[PDB]
Amino acid sequence: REVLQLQEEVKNFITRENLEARVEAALDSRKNYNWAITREGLVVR
Amino acid sequence: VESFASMLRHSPLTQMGPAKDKLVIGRIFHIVENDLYIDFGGKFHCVCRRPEVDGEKYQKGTRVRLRLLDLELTSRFLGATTDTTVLEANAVLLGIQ
Amino acid sequence: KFSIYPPIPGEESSLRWAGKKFEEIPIAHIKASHNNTQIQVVSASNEPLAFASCGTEGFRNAKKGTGIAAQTAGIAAAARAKQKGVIHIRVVVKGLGPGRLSAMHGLIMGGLEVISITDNTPIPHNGCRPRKARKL
Amino acid sequence: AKHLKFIARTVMVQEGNVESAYRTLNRILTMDGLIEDIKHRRYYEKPCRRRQRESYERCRRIYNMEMARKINFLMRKNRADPWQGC
Amino acid sequence: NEDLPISMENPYKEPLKKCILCGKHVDYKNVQLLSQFVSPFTGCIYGRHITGLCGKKQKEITKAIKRAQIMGFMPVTYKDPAYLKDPKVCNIRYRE
Amino acid sequence: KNVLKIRRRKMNHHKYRKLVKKT
């Protein structure tokens, strides 16, 4: 199950071909790993 | 003659269980000027304050509502080989009857 | 109302002091030793306005290390800066010692209003190593 | 040195009440222990004598937090004589 | 016969206190979580008695706070003044 | 305790190093 859940992720590995798009794809896009927590164990963004 | 182990099973102290924040009614059995001595049953007494709401309603025998926090009031300290009971209970008063 | 954390140089705020922002009110630098107190009053674009130390105002030995020796280092630290108009002061205090509060009483008894107080006491995160310890 | 300049160790004086704005500024350094740590780095405290000091500080903290448990556990039993005659 | 108490495995004990970050995952990029455990005046890490973390998760906080200072993700000498109104989970006395 | 069995052996070794220096 690692391998069949690895096969579909190989389709999104950055190749030498499919490269110049996904330099521009995420330089347009964004991700933030930023979140706090409260005095209860509940995460607010 | 009823067996001890049976009458312990049918005994309202046993039926209560973990006594945290549990509604208990108790008799007052000694009044001092500010401090109320409520005998709810149990092993010990407990001491409360005389509130400013209905402060004359607390006489000897006045059935009073108690949250009954934690019949212990024992704690082991840093040198001790037993632990220091105070022979009290820290039950907090609520009301009357 | 009245948050304590200073209005950030991340814009923007709602506090003007004599019609000026936070970041252009002049800064006064108590450098407190254990036997001295030099005070320099600096523009927020870093121009010096007044200098009064503790040893400047008379004293020259271990009477420099007292509180009132820094209070007259602060009373003189206003009127040398009050030739330019320094009515609002940010305070940066560096180092411990006696004349830390007692010099900070000189700036206000010289009539300069203090809006902020900062302890830029230089603590290394284990940088150099200091002298060998006393044996008193 | 290379941070932003007036954020850290900054306390703002409310309407001219400097004598508390130095108290609360003393407190925040003293709760975090910078004032306790400034007055030790005046003289190089020997690496032997850190372990002799910071195992007096910890071991004083055990006893101190145990009295100020036991006192709080017995400050309820100081009201009056309930009996006074026997 | 049937009457005497049995030996069972101790009920009425609620399962043990899950700290604040019990199943979560600290990052070095997650500055707004990490900046919550440093002081808004000195930038110093609050201890286990303040933060109320278990000793496992307190050490992942400190191994990621000190990971993030040298990488240019969070500052050393203060809290991020942008990230100042987060839920104050660290219990501290000053100005009551 | 007493360091008196250390001080007696302390001085022996100081006298030995002062003797071995001199000659």
Next chain:
Amino acid sequence: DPPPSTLLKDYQNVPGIEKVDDVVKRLLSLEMANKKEMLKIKQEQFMKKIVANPEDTRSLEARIIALSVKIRSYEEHLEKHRKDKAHKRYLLMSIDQRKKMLKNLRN
């Protein structure tokens, strides 16, 4: 000194990975692993060719093979790192821990 193009010990009983992508058989490979995963197949390569009861790893004859693999892990460590006196203990204790499991094998 195995080929770095091979698979790990753990990924041999997947019967589809001899026909996968070149990334996947490089992602599942000895070149993309922590170098202890060379040392996993060494105990498995050698437990074939030497003992008639492989995948055992609890006997007298099995324990010598695992140690004489990890002795070489220190010898190749100590090719570099000559002042690293921690592994020079581990080498020179594992030499002589083999020498008693060898002696316990003659007897």
Next chain:
Amino acid sequence: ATPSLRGRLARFGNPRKPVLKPNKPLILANRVGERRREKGEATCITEMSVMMACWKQNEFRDDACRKEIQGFLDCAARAQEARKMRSIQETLGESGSLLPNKLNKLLQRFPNKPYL
């Protein structure tokens, strides 16, 4: 919270270097320590300043700032007054905490006994 003390002191069973090296045995005594106080305060320093701040400007003549130098006496009157009463209000009753001597008489009522 009281910090943990299982593996800390070097004992017979603990297979380890000690963490703590206490000189007195770590047993609560049935007596709390008395009250420390009153270092070299030396008040009315800052109001002596302005008083001596008239005096070098002027010839020395006192009624140039008569109004002010009574104020330097006024806190000096008050600083004498406060230290008189403060030494009594720590004796009639200190609220908040107890006194140690109204604490010691309670700690003997529940003495920490380590001798079984």
Next chain:
Amino acid sequence: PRYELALILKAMQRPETAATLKRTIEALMDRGAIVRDLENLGERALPYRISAHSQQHNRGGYFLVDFYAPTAAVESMVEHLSRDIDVIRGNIVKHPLTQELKECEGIVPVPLAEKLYSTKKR
């Protein structure tokens, strides 16, 4: 194994910071690396005035290159990041999502130690 490349660049104008966002990735598959993903964390303000090769910086764009690579490629990338003129500080951390968590069941209240001293008269 699998690494994140916490990489801060210098604030340089999307035609000309995607120029150099390639040349890190080319220096991954020239060291044999298989680049998984790229992300942008944004062009935030630097936590302190980083001065690196050789001039002073206050703005900085934050990226992340998640990749696999062999053992030898990691100490050879930090060379390539060092002589770079357009990066600020790139440090190759292992991906924290290789190590799976322990089930932290919760804290337990530890007692005071017992039998710490003898039961002597004293």
Next chain:
RNA sequence: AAAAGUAGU
């Protein structure tokens, strides 16, 4: 801050 000595059971 500065104090050194007091003959033998």
Next chain:
RNA sequence: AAAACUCCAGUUGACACAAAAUAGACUACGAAAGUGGCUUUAACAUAUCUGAACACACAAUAGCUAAGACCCAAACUGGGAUUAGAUACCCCACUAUGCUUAGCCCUAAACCUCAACAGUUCAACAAAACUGCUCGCCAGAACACUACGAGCCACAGCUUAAAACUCAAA
């Protein structure tokens, strides 16, 4: 207080082979010595136990030799107070040295003064008492961490280690 420093001090920038606040109220790792800035790589012997004054491997700080680095600290030394004197405490400056490389020297209150492995619940002080088994070591004090032999890259060294004379105690 002197002496020194005015080629000085205070801001604000540029700045490190030095040292690693808080976290550290944690109880971790390693045989010990030791080890708490960050990243990564390599990496933490042995499913019985014991086992070296008969070997192999290591061993804080100090110290040696060769070559660097040099912010700060600092034996030695110099200056200045102090004192009856002050070869010391206090002040200031500076060197060996601390650090890096490469080899030695092989010692500590190297002590948690409590050997390893397995197992149970009273001299006095201290850190409660005691079994089984093994190895090491001890048997009055001082002479003696000494003398002589021997070993050692050590040469004013280390390891091992007595006797005579004395005492009726230590």
